[model samples]
Target chain A: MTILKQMMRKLKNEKIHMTLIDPAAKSPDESAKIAKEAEMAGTDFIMVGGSTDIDERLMDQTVSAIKENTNLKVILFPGSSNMISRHADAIFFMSLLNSSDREFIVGHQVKASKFLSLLGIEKIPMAYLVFSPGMTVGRVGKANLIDSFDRETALSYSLAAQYMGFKLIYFEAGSGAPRPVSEDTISYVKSKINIPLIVGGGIRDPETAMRIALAGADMIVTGSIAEKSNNVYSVLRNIIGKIKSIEIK
Target chain B: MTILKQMMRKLKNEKIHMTLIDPAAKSPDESAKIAKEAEMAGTDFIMVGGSTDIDERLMDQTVSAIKENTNLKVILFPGSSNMISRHADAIFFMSLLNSSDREFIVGHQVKASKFLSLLGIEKIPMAYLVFSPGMTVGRVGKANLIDSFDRETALSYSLAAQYMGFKLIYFEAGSGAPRPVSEDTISYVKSKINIPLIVGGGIRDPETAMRIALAGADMIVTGSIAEKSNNVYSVLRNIIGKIKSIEIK
Candidate 1:
């Protein structure tokens, strides 16, 4: 079955889906280990990507090893267009629609399109929206943010993404996000967009993840939370439980 | 003289323009106080805006009170469009060119354009870019982000903004940004863009700011560093000295 179809099955069955990132895969062996752990823990997908700091080859090695070790979906969260690899199941094809930078909106894609096609990477066109709880990655990653730092303004930016042709909208609070995206903002985005919403960053516990899922996220992705401890499955189970309760309402 | 022209002159002379936020004026009074502080510290320009947690009126008070208090350039950094005020010398009509969210690209501006025009706010159109160490307000602000965390990708985004008619481009490290925007990236963007570049966030010491200035930023800003309780002028003077040296160089 297709990756999206697999995800749909999980969603329909109310099975909580989780994803992991091993951006700092220092070596092929370490990358393989993290992938194996993620599978043993019952993760729904394994994400691969890194900032300019990481080696590109490790991305391919990590994904290949992950697939070799488990049956989970191995995906690419390319920090740059060049991070895409043939070993991945899909790529989070994003356009910075909120950006005034033309390169990010279309230029970068132009540079990456042919490569992605050649690799036969499933393109999951997503609208990636980041909010600051005050993080270095978020600030450095965003363009033209010195003007303001308000959620309503952020929501407005997100509204634009929903109205566009994106298939999924990921509202990132950013890695180590100081505070999770506000409940109000999540509800507002959910109310406006029909696409599946996935939230990542700053989820240290299943409770927080569940809260996020209940807040309106269709998928919950954890990095530091799971990485901090090996019991990601138990933590994930708690998150799944929270989603099942429909408690946020 | 108009604040915009005055700002240009100072930029040419290589002065460390500052702004202070007012505490007593109105809801926006707080930001105004911050702006006033920037002015008192010899900041060439005062940026008036707050984060999502703060109320909307604070932005207005911040901009208006600062302009009323200081003859220096008190520019409005709208947390949202509602913060625009006429008392300001000019506005950093910013776009978060890194995000794909449409509202931040144009919707937010559209909502505030009529009011801004009616108030005769001087718009100094600029592009703001972020380079965060992790999740940051720049991310939570949900502005479009440069897909890659590399100098080349960042320069590409900056170049696009310059080509798109922006007056200046501010590459931010974000508020409380843990790591500074890399010197290599700053210098790279400097080499590529013709417009004045303003760099800020995570710039706690004179050395880092000076280094950033040397890297090619036309102006450097700080809130956390200035928020220090004592000897603010000394810190400001140190950074200003470095900025001046860059011009001399």
Candidate 2:
């Protein structure tokens, strides 16, 4: 069975934590260490690649390094058409829903589809929406960032993604953002879609991560914070532990 | 067979003309009179509804009268959630792809979906894109008009529509503008998608209508021109005749 099916089975029971690691942010050896720590800290999966123009060789090496060191599944959260790796277990084949530029919404997908097919990577069609403080990825992605309070536009894009047959939806407030995607928007979108909803960016602590999880995000992702922490395992354990302890309403 | 399947077969053989009649523009009986004239002029279908807020009863009456008066299939081009009538054979189930307001993009669709299902109307999921000089309907639809020279954005949305499983794509220059969607944009978008491309708005005479058809639009729609013409029958006959004469590049 595909890792997607396995992930879905895991998601059916409880919320999951996926740690995002940028290939450009660390060496392959350093990323391997981070992946091992993430797995031991109870992260459900490891996601690699988020830089605007990831080097294919570096991404492949980082993915392979992570796979060699961790028991967890490696999913590619590619930032562009060429940010792909043949070594990963799966890829988030996503579109920037709120992009004014159509290239991010469909042009890159058109360019990447054949390569992904050739690599035999399990691809999950997803929607990637950026919120306020939408850092460099937002800039490079040419996204029309949804504001924290724009629940109407948020819900619209969410439902549009669902109706369009996209499997997962990722709401990002930019990597290392000042804050994550709004809790209100997250919960509202979650209530509307049966597909898994993942929230990331600006998620740096146990409290914020727990709040996001309680707000109905099926998965929570942390990138730079985990990399910056003195003890990645302890930080992730606290987050996953706090999140797992919540009594969902 | 559904009107959709029949229309596809007709489209494969020759370009077709669909006349747009706004129920709010004329009385139900008068609209029916215009519908009869359009059919006599060799129009393949009659579309009713485009007013931002159309009266449901008036739409139903107009649709029924048109069906009573002409053999041409009556499809609906509703402007809002409530702009629906059970008398039509099919409805253009469309979403304004470039709208910043999610209401036009998905909110209205969510509100209209169940009722459309209940009406048992044959619905064709379409992508409605507005170009320059996007009049009141564009304003009401809250569309972000794609400029004529922006062929990249045009092809992006068109291909995105196809990828998202939308059956048809419409590029409108508003109800009545000085010019229709650019012939270059039309042909470019048409070259990228396998689904039928429909171009509308600002299409006044046989010369301009034929240019659009030859540029790769599968169907040409004229709303205000046909409605405002002194001799609607002759006007439509000339437009349809010119469109049918085109040999695709």
lDDT of each model, Cα atoms only? 0.60, 0.79
| lDDT, candidate 2, B1-249, per-residue tens | 988799898887789899999888888888888888888888998988775576778888999999999998998887534488888998888777777675676557655654554566777777888888888777877777789768878877776566555678888888867889888988877776778999898898999998889888999998636435458888888888889877643
Best by lDDT: 2
Winning candidate number (TM-score): 2
The 10-residue segment with the lowest total lDDT in model 2 chain A: A110-119
Give the runs in model 1 whose Cα sits over 4 Å from its true position.
Answer: A144-151, A224-235, A244-249, B1-249
The total of clashing pairs for model 2 equals 0
| Candidate 2 structure quality by residue, lDDT tens digits, A1-249 | 987687688786778888898888888988999888888888888998775576678887899998988888899887545478889988887778777665676557656654454566777777888888889888888777789768767777776666555678888888878888888888877886678888888999999998899988988988636545458888889998887676543
The TM-score of candidate 2 is 0.61
Per-residue accuracy of model 1 over A145-179 as CA lDDT, tens digit each = 41123655655555444433346666666566655
Give the TM-score of each candidate: 0.48, 0.61
What DockQ values do the models have?
Answer: 0.02, 0.10
